[model samples]
Target: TTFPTLDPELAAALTMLPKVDFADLPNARATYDALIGAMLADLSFDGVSLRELSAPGLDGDPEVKIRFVTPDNTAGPVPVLLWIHGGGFAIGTAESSDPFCVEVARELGFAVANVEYRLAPETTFPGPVNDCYAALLYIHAHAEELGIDPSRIAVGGQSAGGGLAAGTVLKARDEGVVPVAFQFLEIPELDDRLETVSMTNFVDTPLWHRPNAILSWKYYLGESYSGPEDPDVSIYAAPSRATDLTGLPPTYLSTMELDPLRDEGIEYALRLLQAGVSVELHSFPGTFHGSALVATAAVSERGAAEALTAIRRGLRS
Candidate 1:
């Protein structure tokens, strides 16, 4: 299905991309993992170093692994980002986020803690978010040794990871144990209600869609999850469920025009703005989820450049 509004360059490359079917999750997981592995096989970053660290989990849970990426020859303690990777809360890894972490560190000259939180269906709710929170706390607890400024730390992610970053930031605000300076949510999947026009209409969109979203939430929340009708939903698991957005840090949110998660990200940015938080929202036209993979496209180039500029602006305070 060729979307007429799709960027011509993106349309040309769409056929080369894989169509992930969440119906067969195990196969999808293996396929995605191998696909990412091959894409990053020979890729390595310069002027950045990655140090593996482990943080003790909350409430007797297993330890959460963290990949701390830092730029070389820092002047002193610098701002850091507690980063999360996207996988619909099911199938991503810290290794998957290495490139971004390294780039952010190298470009911004800031440290990044790439989290290796456990996937869902196997770990469920608070567990995944809790791991992220634990990672954040670790960042703060070890700030001195890590040579990072605790008060200047940022939190961010993409897709499901972006949702988790928002949720994790919410948890951080409520707990008041750590302070977050900014949030970067890229194509975040926030609402579980699935009531938005985009969510309702983009069932067949590439990469992420309603079907995959359904499976994502189900696996993340457990098999018994019935979405919006469920009474036991927690804001920490679905941040849009939170009624209060006040006191949250400045945020930069981006959405793809043709992505299923577009409206939710837009709505979330609006809500954050209304709550008196500073926000910058961008909705790139004619792009679907993961379309950034077509990095050579003009839109993709613009999006990539815009992201770094936004991050710099957000962090430059």
Candidate 2:
């Protein structure tokens, strides 16, 4: 299959951007931390206030660490976004996502509970997502104490974190316990089946591709996983395996044309639509996975603007 043309704004970056090698888990983790550390160094705190927090883990697990970032001087119970970070679920911490979380709090006046779920091949399925759910539960259970609006809670993330966010919301719905008001999935890695056209064809694409996607599922799914068509895979592990999406919260889903996850995200959107859930889906033209990282690019800037707009409207409902 032919790769889609890159948007002129991102064309030059096609060869400049770096792609992580996930074959060596420890090395990948170190590389990821270094990159994230650099990001933390460059980030501007400005009007945002941040605090380290933790949620009681499910069953006998340890506490789930979280970074609670909020706008300064914001009084009363405010809406919050439980933000999850991405590293194909294998590497990354909530601190790595501080830029986005901090920015949202500073710009939109929304509080962010940045979840620091444990990584994969160590924590495995249900563990990471459970940690995120616990954070959500913590937020909901202590909304009054935390000064957060339980009704306006939104769960979201990018890439693998996005998948976990979807899974977290799904688990919450199926449990029929706590409620989620909104979901924001950005270039989410939702399917482990890895059979979509984009997944099949984009084996060598930049940043995130079919090969990296395969390793991601492998690391997250663990030893029990047999193949791409493994039937016993839980919907909570891969939301694309889920058949029912009716009770999910209102969603804002985004996709990049040249990304391996593009088709699955598009298909998921249609399925969500068919499930009668309200969704605003955008398959950005001439873009690839994680292309929005180039913040100065016109297309990336365009996406950044839309995120704020969508969050404003999404939280209102």
Candidate 3:
């Protein structure tokens, strides 16, 4: 089905961008890496310095990687944002989001920690999410050494990363090992049941849709993925399944009207409020999944601005 009325700028931008069918690709990870490299080819890293660190992983797994993006002139302990990149959890890298991390550090004066969590189908449930948690712990544990203000750390990301951010936060809260100041989710892919109306529909939405989502959950959950009808899904794998949301940090979440994950995002926001968690929610009209990739559009600009402002406020206090 055709998408609803798209913003003029977004519409024009979409027409000019080349489209690749990831479903037909033989090697999704390599293609995704190359595509992201090309997209970030012209991105300037003037105000930020990128560094890499490793966090302990599972017994048999290798250490997880974290990219530290710091402003050129940081003084004292600065706030930090742990960023998770999105590629439906199947294929993506910490390096894929260097441009975004660099911008956040430059604009918000944040020491951004971008998690290079293990991807799915290769590393199943808990592996990807645990990597993010370890990254969070590494930052908090090395707060003094990293020059980070422990009390001002926020976790955030896009799509699958956003989902992982939420799941990581949940794990952190339950584990009582780390304290999160805030959560910033952009077009988060949460619920795994795929039972919501939006989840069951939107097969033809741009970038992501029901079919892609099905494969994402199947791969991420791996052997743990029971059929969609199973009621025993773990909250660590899908934050929407969490029964208790109390003590979660304040949140800033957005959803695209034409996206398959819209309803779950909205419901999660409502439930967070019900659970006494502060939430600032925005649902952009006339937009499809990943519409913000058209960075030049008016709606995209507004969303980005709001996200920046919210991040600033959340981390400052």
Q: For each candidate, C-alpha RMSD in Å? A: 1.1, 1.6, 1.7
Against the hidden reference, what TM-scores do the models get?
A: 0.97, 0.97, 0.95
Instruction: Write the residue-wise lDDT of candidate 2 on 12-123 in tens digits.
Output: 8776566587888788888778867987897899998899888999989899988999899888588899999989999888888888898889988899999999999998
> Which is the better candidate, 2 or 3, if ranked by lDDT?
2
Model 1 Cα shift for residue 170 (angstroms): 0.5
Query: Compared with the true structure, what per-residue lDDT tens digits does model 1 show for residues 116-148?
Result: 999988999989999999999998999999898
How much does candidate 3 score in TM-score?
Answer: 0.95
Ranked by TM-score, top first:
1, 2, 3
Query: For candidate 3, lDDT tens digit of each residue in 1-317?
Result: 14438766676655544433445434766666776898888999998899898888756667888999999887859999999999888888888889889889999888999999988888888789989988898899999999999999999999999999999999989999889999999999999888898988887677778878888888888776676876767797899999899999999999998889999999999999999999999999888788887778889889989988999999985
Candidate 3 or 2, higher TM-score: 2
Which stretches of model 1 miss by more than 4 angstroms?
Answer: none
Residue 66, candidate 3: alpha-carbon lDDT: 91
Q: Residue 200's C-alpha lDDT in candidate 1? A: 95
Best by TM-score: 1
Error of 2 at 271 (Å): 0.6
Assess the local accuracy of residue 113 in candidate 2 as a C-alpha lDDT between 0 and 100.
97
